[PDB]
Amino acid sequence: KTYLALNENPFPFPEDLVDEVFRRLNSDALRIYYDSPDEELIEKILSYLDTDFLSKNNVSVGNGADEIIYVMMLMFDRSVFFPPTYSCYRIFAKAVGAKFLEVPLTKDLRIPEVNVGEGDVVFIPNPNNPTGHVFEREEIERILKTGAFVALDEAYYEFHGESYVDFLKKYENLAVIRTFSKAFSLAAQRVGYVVASEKFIDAYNRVRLPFNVSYVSQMFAKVALDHREIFEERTKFIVEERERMKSALREMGYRITDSRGNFVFVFMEKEEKERLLEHLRTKNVAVRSFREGVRITIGKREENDMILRELEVFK
Amino acid sequence: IAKRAYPYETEKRDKTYLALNENPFPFPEDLVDEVFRRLNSDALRIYYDSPDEELIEKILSYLDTDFLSKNNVSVGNGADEIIYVMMLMFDRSVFFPPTYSCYRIFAKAVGAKFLEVPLTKDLRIPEVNVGEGDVVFIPNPNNPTGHVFEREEIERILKTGAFVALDEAYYEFHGESYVDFLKKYENLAVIRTFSKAFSLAAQRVGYVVASEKFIDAYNRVRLPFNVSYVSQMFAKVALDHREIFEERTKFIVEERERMKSALREMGYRITDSRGNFVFVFMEKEEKERLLEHLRTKNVAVRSFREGVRITIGKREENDMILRELEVF
């Protein structure tokens, strides 16, 4: 089935690299409790962070970015996010017992004013999924100035471009969650990492699972990270294709969001929305329905092109 | 931020590591190749189904029961992941030192109210006031003592109405398992693993076998995609060839029974451990002499309160501990 609903990378994990992971993994290793963030794994992340202020004690990993999201709500009095955002902030917080606040983005997808301060963690997923839109750095600082800890979910960084990690230079109340699930077609290996103040990272490692990342998964992320150029090129394709179809959905009379993720968001009331959802259900296509609209993930051209076609005969 | 629980560090492994109850043998290369033979790369891109349909069915076939169904089992990113979340699913968590040490840690890290009630001098579950809303963790075989709790004990708490996370991490290394209690109790849950028996500690793949209503609740609180596609692929290939791991489990116990015997012979006070390790009791200033003997010959063991918990290793490694214990 043409699946375009979870924002999965279209490209499979390079068969080539898999072989590396194969030849890089020592059998006698699977037996032992391998280190969560492997020293080598972090060295390769930091190079990937290409910063001049970050160090080992400034990064940590998590069983997929979810985990960090998941373990972070465990170490803060209250979690605060803004629908429409990542569908799991709500679910995890509830599963966790994290006290949370859902203050909706303004009419114009901006971060709303919220009495939030230290003791709170505001999960701001920039690019914001599902809208894939980006809040300029002025909006993140506004909250950072409140003292609240901000969990900058950069799950779609590789698809946007700039990241606010540099903010760690001047703000200690920030942590950034990136992951290999999107740009690295490793959503099956569950490998996410976070960059924050040591202070944070340390407490984080006291809460996260001591061995949340499977030895073979880090191998995958380390490797993926050895061959960054491959993926970046895949990204160059996800974006081109996203932008290609964002101007297309627009051209087609659709109210979408200037999304900078590996997906595009299209608005539409329950009525019509629900309509194409069942019509797509017949064409074997699967997108992701949210609230005010739908979030079709970017796939190969064919998969994408198809989406575009079912939307023309619709509206 | 204010939480000075336990600082995350890293075990500096010695020439001989016997502190984590890891299997001595590597994972069958034969099988690793079998895993990468199956590894569909296009699976890596998509979000693989956490408890994988096929993994569950394999897990069921390993439990070898008629009543367990794809709705009484679930997977965790290690018993650890399972021990963890469960503590979120219950107002209070209860365990009995000496139990797994990571229990305190997880609860205390999670922010879950917990009561630590030491096990009797006979290594048995004490008398505790538990009930619904509570989850009591019982490692059978026990850790680090390795001793087995009597079905009677697990039932004495079961009937209590308090949810039981019967952590059978060391099942393999011990004949029985109390999963059939799920035939009568719905507030029970058996936690398993691949870490120790299947030499998969490095892959975080553990399973929970519980009532249908629970796995359901369980699957809502834990992470949606807790387990790697490749971690799951290792479990399957593992269960598809358990005949090999049964040979290793066999050798680990035979080799464990040789030491436990070797130790009673040297006068050492030892537990009746059925885990892939053996606990030896020792007093403060006599154990650290050992610890120092060992540390000197690059031998790492887990020193506990009342003693040490040597993990079964390979022939040579095991004889070594004996030798490093005959001089005493």
Select the residue of A22, A203, A209 nearest B77 (Cβ to Cβ): A209
- Most B CBs within 10 A among A214, A231, A238, hence the mutation to make, goes to A214
Q: Is B202 close to A215, i.e. CB distance below 8 A? A: yes
Task: Give me the CATH topology for the region B38-240.
Answer: Aspartate Aminotransferase; domain 2 (3.40.640)
3-state SS assignment for residue A28: helix
Resolution expressed in Å:
2.8
Residue B205's alpha-carbon distances to A251, B76, B192, B228, in angstroms, are: 48, 6, 9, 8
On whether the CB atoms of residues A88 and A66 are closer than 8 A, the answer is yes
What is the total residue count of chain A? 315
- For A1, other C-beta atoms within 10 Å of its C-beta total 8
Dist. CA A314–CA B13, nearest whole Å: 63
Strand duo A99-102 + B16-18: pairing: unpaired
DSSP track, B170-181: T-TTSS--GGGG
On whether the CB atoms of residues B192 and B79 are closer than 8 A, the answer is yes
Residue A98's alpha-carbon distances to A90, A177, A192, A251, B2, in angstroms, are: 9, 18, 21, 42, 17
Q: Where in chain A is the domain with CATH 3.40.640.10?
A: 26-226
Contacts of B45 in chain A (CB under 8 A): 8-13, 185-188
On whether the CB atoms of residues A119 and A76 are closer than 8 A, the answer is yes
Select the residue of A9, A30, A188 nearest B27 (Cβ to Cβ): A30
Dist. CA A202–CA A247, nearest whole Å: 44
Kindly state the tokens that stand for B84: 């963890």
DSSP label at A176? Answer: E
On whether the CB atoms of residues B87 and B189 are closer than 8 A, the answer is no
For chains A and B, CB pairs below 8 A equal: 187
- Centroid of chain to Cα B101: 11
Contacts of B29 in chain A (CB under 8 A): 27
Q: Please report, as a single letter, which amino acid is at residue A95.
A: A
On whether the CB atoms of residues A12 and A185 are closer than 8 A, the answer is yes
B-contacting residues in A 6-65 (Cβ below 8 Å): 6, 8-15, 18-19, 22, 25-35, 63-64
Dist. CA B107–CA A22, nearest whole Å: 36
3-state SS assignment for residue B275: coil
Dist. CA B295–CA B300, nearest whole Å: 6
Tell me the shortest Cα–Cα distance from A299 to chain B, in angstroms: 11
- For B187, other C-beta atoms within 10 Å of its C-beta total 22
Please, what CATH class does the domain formed by A26-226 belong to? alpha beta
Element (H, E) at B217: helix B212-221
A-contacting residues in B 98-137 (Cβ below 8 Å): 102, 109-111
Count, in order, helices (H) and strands (E) of chain B: 11, 11
On whether the CB atoms of residues B311 and B13 are closer than 8 A, the answer is no
What is the total residue count of chain B? 328
Instruction: Say whether residue A192 is in contact with chain B using an 8 A CB cutoff.
Output: no
Q: Where in chain B is the domain with CATH 3.90.1150.10?
A: 1-37+241-328
- Give the HSE-up count for residue A18: Cα atoms under 13 Å, Cβ half-sphere: 22
By C-alpha distance, which of A125, A120, A150, A18 is closest to A66?
A125
* Rounded (5°) CA angle A258-A284-A267: 25
Dist. CA B55–CA B172, nearest whole Å: 18
- For A255, other C-beta atoms within 10 Å of its C-beta total 12
3-state SS assignment for residue B75: strand
On whether the CB atoms of residues B196 and B170 are closer than 8 A, the answer is yes
| Backbone angles phi and psi of A15, in degrees to 5 | -55, -40
Element (H, E) at B10: none
Dist. CA A99–CA A84, nearest whole Å: 18
Cis (ω within 30 of 0) for the bond into B51? no
Dist. CA B62–CA A9, nearest whole Å: 34
| Backbone angles phi and psi of A14, in degrees to 5 | -35, 115
Q: Is A187 close to B44, i.e. CB distance below 8 A? A: yes
Instruction: Say whether residue A218 is in contact with chain B using an 8 A CB cutoff.
Output: no
Dist. CA A219–CA B32, nearest whole Å: 14
Q: Where in chain A is the domain with CATH 3.90.1150.10?
A: 1-25+227-315
Please, what CATH class does the domain formed by B1-37+241-328 belong to? alpha beta
What is the distance in angstroms between the CA of the first residue and the CA of the last residue of chain B? 47
The technique by which this structure was obtained is X-ray
Beta bridge partners of B300: B17
Q: Please report, as a single letter, which amino acid is at residue A77.
A: D
By C-alpha distance, which of B49, B17, B141, B300 is closest to A6?
B49
Kindly state the tokens that stand for A225: 């990270």
Q: Please report, as a single letter, which amino acid is at residue B2.
A: A
Kindly state the tokens that stand for A192: 């996410």
Find all residues with CB under 8 Å of B184, minimum gap 6, and list them.
none
Instruction: Say whether residue B227 is in contact with chain A using an 8 A CB cutoff.
Output: yes
- Residue spans of alpha helices (H) in chain A: 15-24, 27-31, 39-49, 64-72, 87-96, 137-144, 157-160, 198-207, 215-226, 228-251, 270-282, 301-312
Q: Is A30 close to B201, i.e. CB distance below 8 A? A: yes
Cis (ω within 30 of 0) for the bond into A84? yes
Instruction: Say whether residue B185 is in contact with chain A using an 8 A CB cutoff.
Output: no
3-state SS assignment for residue B12: coil
Q: Is A63 close to B102, i.e. CB distance below 8 A? A: no
CATH code for the part of the protein at A1-25+227-315: 3.90.1150.10
